[PDB]
Each structure stands twice: as structure tokens, then as C-alpha cells.
Coordinates of C-alpha atoms and ligand atoms in Angstrom, one line a residue:
Chain A
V1 CA 29.7 -33.3 0.4
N2 CA 27.4 -36.0 -1.2
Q3 CA 27.2 -39.5 -0.2
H4 CA 26.3 -42.7 -2.3
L5 CA 25.1 -44.8 0.7
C6 CA 23.5 -48.3 0.5
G7 CA 22.3 -51.2 2.9
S8 CA 24.1 -51.3 6.2
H9 CA 26.2 -48.2 5.2
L10 CA 23.2 -46.2 5.2
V11 CA 22.6 -47.2 8.8
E12 CA 26.1 -46.4 10.0
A13 CA 25.9 -42.8 8.7
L14 CA 22.8 -42.4 10.6
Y15 CA 24.4 -43.9 13.7
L16 CA 27.0 -41.2 13.4
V17 CA 25.1 -38.3 12.2
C18 CA 22.3 -38.6 15.1
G19 CA 24.7 -40.3 17.4
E20 CA 23.2 -39.4 20.7
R21 CA 19.6 -38.4 19.6
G22 CA 18.8 -41.9 18.1
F23 CA 16.8 -42.4 14.9
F24 CA 14.2 -44.3 12.7
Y25 CA 15.2 -46.5 10.0
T26 CA 12.2 -46.7 7.5
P27 CA 13.1 -48.2 4.1
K28 CA 10.2 -48.2 1.5
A29 CA 9.0 -51.7 1.0
Chain B
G1 CA 12.7 -41.5 0.4
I2 CA 15.9 -41.5 2.4
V3 CA 16.9 -45.2 1.8
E4 CA 15.6 -45.2 -1.7
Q5 CA 17.7 -42.0 -2.4
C6 CA 20.7 -42.4 -0.4
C7 CA 21.3 -45.4 -2.3
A8 CA 19.7 -44.9 -5.8
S9 CA 21.1 -41.4 -6.2
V10 CA 23.2 -39.6 -3.7
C11 CA 22.5 -37.8 -0.3
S12 CA 24.4 -35.4 1.9
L13 CA 24.6 -35.8 5.8
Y14 CA 22.5 -32.7 6.2
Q15 CA 19.6 -34.7 4.8
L16 CA 20.4 -37.4 6.9
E17 CA 19.8 -35.3 10.1
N18 CA 16.0 -35.2 9.1
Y19 CA 16.1 -38.8 10.5
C20 CA 17.2 -38.5 14.1
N21 CA 14.6 -37.8 16.7
Chain C
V1 CA 27.6 -34.4 16.9
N2 CA 29.6 -35.6 19.8
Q3 CA 30.8 -39.4 20.0
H4 CA 33.6 -41.7 21.3
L5 CA 35.1 -42.8 18.1
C6 CA 37.9 -45.6 18.2
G7 CA 40.2 -47.3 15.9
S8 CA 38.4 -48.3 12.7
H9 CA 35.3 -46.2 13.8
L10 CA 37.1 -42.9 13.6
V11 CA 38.4 -43.9 10.0
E12 CA 35.0 -44.6 8.8
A13 CA 33.7 -41.3 10.4
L14 CA 36.5 -39.9 8.4
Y15 CA 35.3 -41.1 4.9
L16 CA 31.7 -40.0 5.5
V17 CA 32.7 -36.6 6.5
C18 CA 35.5 -36.0 4.1
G19 CA 34.0 -38.0 1.2
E20 CA 35.7 -37.1 -2.2
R21 CA 38.7 -34.9 -1.0
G22 CA 39.5 -37.8 1.3
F23 CA 41.9 -37.6 4.4
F24 CA 45.1 -38.1 6.2
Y25 CA 44.9 -40.4 9.2
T26 CA 48.2 -39.4 11.3
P27 CA 47.8 -40.9 14.8
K28 CA 51.6 -40.5 15.6
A29 CA 51.0 -36.8 15.6
Chain D
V1 CA 45.7 -62.8 -2.2
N2 CA 44.0 -60.0 -4.2
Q3 CA 40.9 -58.0 -2.9
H4 CA 38.1 -56.2 -4.7
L5 CA 37.6 -53.3 -2.3
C6 CA 35.4 -50.2 -2.8
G7 CA 34.2 -47.2 -0.9
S8 CA 34.2 -47.6 3.0
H9 CA 35.9 -51.1 2.5
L10 CA 39.0 -49.5 0.9
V11 CA 39.6 -47.5 3.9
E12 CA 39.3 -50.3 6.4
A13 CA 41.8 -52.3 4.6
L14 CA 43.9 -49.2 4.9
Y15 CA 43.3 -48.8 8.5
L16 CA 44.4 -52.3 9.0
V17 CA 47.5 -52.8 6.8
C18 CA 49.1 -49.5 8.0
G19 CA 47.6 -49.7 11.5
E20 CA 50.1 -47.8 13.6
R21 CA 52.0 -45.7 10.8
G22 CA 48.7 -44.0 9.6
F23 CA 47.8 -43.3 5.9
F24 CA 46.6 -40.9 3.3
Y25 CA 43.3 -41.4 1.5
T26 CA 43.4 -39.9 -2.0
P27 CA 40.7 -41.0 -4.5
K28 CA 41.0 -39.3 -8.0
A29 CA 38.4 -36.8 -8.4
Chain E
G1 CA 45.3 -45.1 -8.7
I2 CA 44.6 -46.8 -5.6
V3 CA 41.1 -46.2 -5.1
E4 CA 40.2 -46.4 -8.8
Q5 CA 42.0 -49.6 -9.1
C6 CA 41.2 -51.4 -5.7
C7 CA 37.6 -51.0 -6.7
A8 CA 37.7 -51.1 -10.5
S9 CA 39.9 -54.1 -10.8
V10 CA 41.5 -55.9 -7.9
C11 CA 44.4 -55.1 -5.5
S12 CA 46.5 -56.8 -2.9
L13 CA 47.5 -55.7 0.7
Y14 CA 51.2 -55.3 -0.6
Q15 CA 50.1 -52.6 -2.9
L16 CA 48.1 -51.0 -0.2
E17 CA 51.2 -50.6 2.0
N18 CA 52.4 -47.9 -0.6
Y19 CA 49.7 -45.7 1.2
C20 CA 50.9 -45.7 4.7
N21 CA 53.4 -43.1 5.8
Chain F
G1 CA 46.0 -35.4 17.5
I2 CA 42.6 -36.9 16.1
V3 CA 42.8 -40.0 18.3
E4 CA 43.2 -38.0 21.6
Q5 CA 40.8 -35.2 20.7
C6 CA 38.3 -37.9 19.4
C7 CA 38.8 -41.4 21.1
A8 CA 40.0 -40.4 24.5
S9 CA 38.0 -37.2 24.1
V10 CA 34.8 -36.5 22.3
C11 CA 34.5 -34.4 19.0
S12 CA 31.9 -33.6 16.5
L13 CA 31.4 -34.0 12.8
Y14 CA 32.6 -30.3 12.8
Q15 CA 36.2 -31.2 14.2
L16 CA 36.6 -34.1 11.6
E17 CA 36.6 -31.6 8.7
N18 CA 40.1 -30.6 9.9
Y19 CA 41.6 -33.8 8.7
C20 CA 39.9 -33.7 5.2
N21 CA 42.9 -33.4 2.8
Chain G
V1 CA 51.3 -55.1 11.3
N2 CA 50.7 -55.2 15.2
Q3 CA 46.9 -54.2 16.3
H4 CA 44.3 -54.9 18.9
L5 CA 41.6 -56.6 16.9
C6 CA 38.4 -57.5 19.1
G7 CA 35.0 -59.1 18.2
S8 CA 33.8 -58.2 14.7
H9 CA 37.0 -56.5 14.0
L10 CA 39.1 -59.6 13.9
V11 CA 36.7 -61.4 11.7
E12 CA 37.1 -58.5 9.3
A13 CA 40.7 -58.7 9.4
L14 CA 40.4 -62.4 8.7
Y15 CA 38.6 -61.9 5.5
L16 CA 41.0 -59.5 4.1
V17 CA 43.8 -61.5 4.8
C18 CA 42.4 -64.8 4.0
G19 CA 40.2 -63.8 0.9
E20 CA 39.2 -66.6 -1.2
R21 CA 40.5 -69.6 0.8
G22 CA 38.6 -68.3 3.7
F23 CA 38.7 -69.1 7.2
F24 CA 37.6 -70.8 10.5
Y25 CA 37.0 -68.6 13.6
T26 CA 37.1 -71.2 16.4
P27 CA 37.2 -68.8 19.7
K28 CA 36.6 -71.6 22.0
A29 CA 39.8 -73.0 21.3
Chain H
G1 CA 43.6 -69.2 20.4
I2 CA 43.2 -66.4 17.9
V3 CA 41.1 -64.2 20.5
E4 CA 43.8 -64.4 23.1
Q5 CA 46.6 -64.0 20.7
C6 CA 44.9 -61.1 18.9
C7 CA 42.4 -59.3 21.1
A8 CA 43.9 -59.7 24.5
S9 CA 47.4 -59.6 22.9
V10 CA 48.4 -58.2 19.6
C11 CA 49.2 -59.9 16.6
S12 CA 50.2 -59.0 12.9
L13 CA 48.8 -59.7 9.5
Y14 CA 51.4 -62.4 9.5
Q15 CA 49.8 -64.6 12.3
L16 CA 46.3 -64.1 10.9
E17 CA 47.5 -66.4 8.0
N18 CA 47.3 -69.2 10.4
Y19 CA 43.5 -69.4 10.3
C20 CA 43.1 -69.3 6.5
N21 CA 41.4 -72.6 5.8
Chain I
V1 CA 13.4 -61.9 6.9
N2 CA 15.9 -62.5 4.0
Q3 CA 19.1 -60.8 3.6
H4 CA 21.1 -60.0 0.6
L5 CA 24.7 -60.3 1.8
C6 CA 28.0 -60.0 0.0
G7 CA 31.7 -60.0 0.8
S8 CA 32.7 -58.7 4.1
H9 CA 28.9 -58.2 5.1
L10 CA 28.4 -62.0 4.9
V11 CA 31.0 -62.5 7.5
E12 CA 29.5 -60.0 9.9
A13 CA 26.2 -61.7 9.7
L14 CA 28.1 -65.0 10.5
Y15 CA 30.0 -63.2 13.2
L16 CA 26.8 -62.4 14.8
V17 CA 24.5 -65.2 14.2
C18 CA 27.0 -67.8 15.5
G19 CA 28.6 -65.5 18.0
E20 CA 30.2 -67.7 20.7
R21 CA 30.3 -71.1 18.6
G22 CA 32.6 -69.9 16.0
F23 CA 32.1 -70.7 12.4
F24 CA 33.7 -71.8 9.1
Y25 CA 33.8 -69.3 6.0
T26 CA 34.0 -71.3 2.8
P27 CA 33.4 -69.4 -0.4
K28 CA 33.4 -71.6 -3.7
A29 CA 36.5 -70.7 -5.6
Chain J
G1 CA 26.4 -72.5 -1.5
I2 CA 26.3 -70.2 1.3
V3 CA 28.6 -67.2 0.0
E4 CA 27.4 -67.8 -3.5
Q5 CA 23.8 -67.7 -2.4
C6 CA 23.7 -65.2 0.2
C7 CA 25.2 -62.8 -2.3
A8 CA 23.9 -64.0 -5.7
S9 CA 20.2 -64.5 -4.3
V10 CA 19.0 -63.9 -0.8
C11 CA 19.4 -65.8 2.5
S12 CA 17.8 -65.7 5.9
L13 CA 19.8 -66.0 9.2
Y14 CA 18.4 -69.5 9.7
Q15 CA 20.3 -70.8 6.8
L16 CA 23.3 -68.9 8.1
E17 CA 23.0 -71.1 11.2
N18 CA 24.3 -74.1 9.4
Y19 CA 27.7 -72.5 9.6
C20 CA 28.6 -72.2 13.0
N21 CA 30.1 -75.2 14.6
Chain K
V1 CA 22.6 -65.7 20.5
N2 CA 24.0 -63.8 23.2
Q3 CA 26.8 -61.2 22.6
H4 CA 28.1 -57.8 23.9
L5 CA 26.9 -55.3 21.2
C6 CA 28.1 -51.6 21.6
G7 CA 27.7 -48.4 19.5
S8 CA 27.6 -49.1 15.7
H9 CA 27.8 -52.6 16.4
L10 CA 24.2 -52.7 17.7
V11 CA 22.9 -50.7 15.0
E12 CA 24.3 -53.3 12.7
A13 CA 22.7 -56.1 14.5
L14 CA 19.5 -54.2 14.1
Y15 CA 19.7 -54.0 10.4
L16 CA 20.3 -57.7 9.9
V17 CA 17.6 -59.0 12.5
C18 CA 15.0 -56.3 11.3
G19 CA 15.8 -56.1 7.5
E20 CA 13.0 -54.7 5.4
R21 CA 10.6 -53.5 8.3
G22 CA 13.5 -51.5 9.7
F23 CA 13.9 -50.3 13.2
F24 CA 13.8 -47.5 15.6
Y25 CA 17.2 -46.8 17.8
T26 CA 16.2 -44.8 20.9
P27 CA 19.2 -44.9 23.3
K28 CA 17.8 -42.1 25.5
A29 CA 14.9 -44.3 26.5
Chain L
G1 CA 16.5 -49.6 26.9
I2 CA 18.4 -51.4 24.1
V3 CA 21.9 -50.2 25.1
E4 CA 21.4 -51.3 28.6
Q5 CA 19.9 -54.6 27.9
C6 CA 22.5 -55.2 25.0
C7 CA 25.7 -53.3 25.7
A8 CA 25.9 -53.4 29.3
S9 CA 24.0 -56.4 29.4
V10 CA 23.9 -59.2 26.8
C11 CA 20.9 -60.2 24.7
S12 CA 20.1 -62.5 21.9
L13 CA 19.0 -62.0 18.4
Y14 CA 15.5 -62.7 19.9
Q15 CA 15.5 -59.8 21.8
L16 CA 16.3 -57.3 18.9
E17 CA 13.2 -58.2 17.3
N18 CA 11.6 -55.9 19.8
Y19 CA 13.0 -52.9 18.0
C20 CA 12.0 -53.9 14.6
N21 CA 9.5 -51.2 13.7
Ligands
ZN101 ZN1 34.1 -51.8 16.9
ZN102 ZN1 29.6 -52.8 1.5

């Protein structure tokens, strides 16, 4: 589906979806 | 990109995978 | 992918995955 | 009291209040 | 209902119990 | 159920789809 | 009802329960 | 305190009311 | 940095920053 | 104060420390 | 100050600390 | 890495700064 994800919720989705692999969090500034 | 979008608009977990390593 | 997801953590993986259809969380079962 | 609860926060309140019992999450679509 | 309401307006944990099983 | 398969066990995003109403 | 609530989890049960009056979280004690 | 009663132990929504300021 | 923190997110920041010490959550009413 | 501010405007973790005990 | 921070918990401490610059979460490493 | 230093170990807000991109 589609998800409307902001702030800390964005990073949980990333923690979950990459789990194991790890990830980069790069917001625009 | 990612953040802008996932928040502003909508985004699927498939697009999210482009962020792991 | 493949993680340990306990207590509230699993309910949150559930909302992300499931989104709009939603879910049932029946631990008894 | 009263709580203003949206998205994933709605589901945590449900995880807590039903705990043990389990629950159904059925948003309108 | 539940979601609509708990978000849109306000809702107490007593109303929330109508959702367990 | 979900807990065993997922908290004791391990499971993927794939298996959570089974609990989407 | 009756759950195991550790670390951040307990502070979150606290905000939901307590709401507007708020709370004190004094673990030392 | 709260931790023992609630993290080691178990406690209900009822008992958290005691920590509402 | 600076953080825009509301509702339950406010209390997580407090759970983290005081950790050990504990804290008071006193919203205005 | 704290809540009003951290939400309404912006707040750093340094200001947040004024809340522990 | 000094806490045990596991799984999603650490990613959340990361967003609060880091904020706008963001972070990398490379567990493999 | 981060996990060991922080989940097995213990670490402060100070050490998380090292993972800020
Ligand atoms: Zn947890
Ligand atoms: Zn939120």
C-alpha cells in the first residue's frame, strides 16, 4: 500500500524495511 | 526526496527499500 | 525482511504493512 | 481523560488497552 | 468510527475497549 | 500464531501480510 | 489490563493514561 | 516504584493512575 | 540541534534525555 | 512552557534537561 | 546520558540527537 | 559498532553524535 510517514515515523519504517542491512537517513535541509 | 515525499505526499515500502545499504 | 518483533513492535510492523485494510492482532491464537 | 490519537498512535493505545485480549484495527476506507 | 473519530475528534480509552475481542 | 511465528521466531514483511484484514 | 511495560514503553502508557494532568516518572524511588 | 511494580512485575491501567500528577 | 516535538514524541525525548534521573511531565491545561 | 513550546515552536534537548529531577 | 538502547529504540535516539543532518545506521559494522 | 557500543553496552547522547551524517 502507500504510507503517509513523517518525522520519527519515517525512520521506524526504515528501521523495519531494511532491518538487518542498515540504512542512511538523509532529509533535505 | 524520501523524507520530503514520504511526508508531503505518500510513499510505499518498496520505494523505502532504496534506502538501505 | 527478517526481524525479532515483540509486543508493541509487532503491532507497529502491522500498521505499516497492512495500512488501509488494517489488521486483527489475535495473540491467543 | 480524552485522547487525540492518529495513525500509528491509535494502534499503540489499542495495543495497550486490550493488551492480552487482542483486537481488530478497522479504519474506514 | 474509531479511527475516524479518535483522530478527527477525541476519544477515551473506555471507547477504545470496544475494540478488543 | 503471529507472536510465536514473529517474536519467538523471526518472520518477514511477507508473513505479516497474512494478518491484514 | 495487565502487561509487562519496560523503558520507553511505560512512559508511553503513562501519557495515554494520564493525558492532560501529566505525570512524574521517578524510577529511583 | 513504578518500574518494579510494572516492568519486573505486571500492573494494570488502574495502577498507572497513581503516577498521574 | 532543534526539535519540533509534540504529544507522545515530547515524552520520548524526555525519557531519553533524563534517562536515569526521571522527570516531570507538566503540560499547560 | 515545555510542552507548549516544544510543540508550537521548536526546542533543543538542552532545554529539555531542565525537566529531569 | 547512559541507557540500554536496542532495535528501534536506538534509531529513535538517533533521530532526536542527529535531527536535520540525519544519520547512517550500519549495524553490520 | 553502534549496536555493541549501545545495546550490549551503554552509551550517552554524546556518543550518538558520532553517527550523525
Ligand atoms: Zn521496545
Ligand atoms: Zn507521531
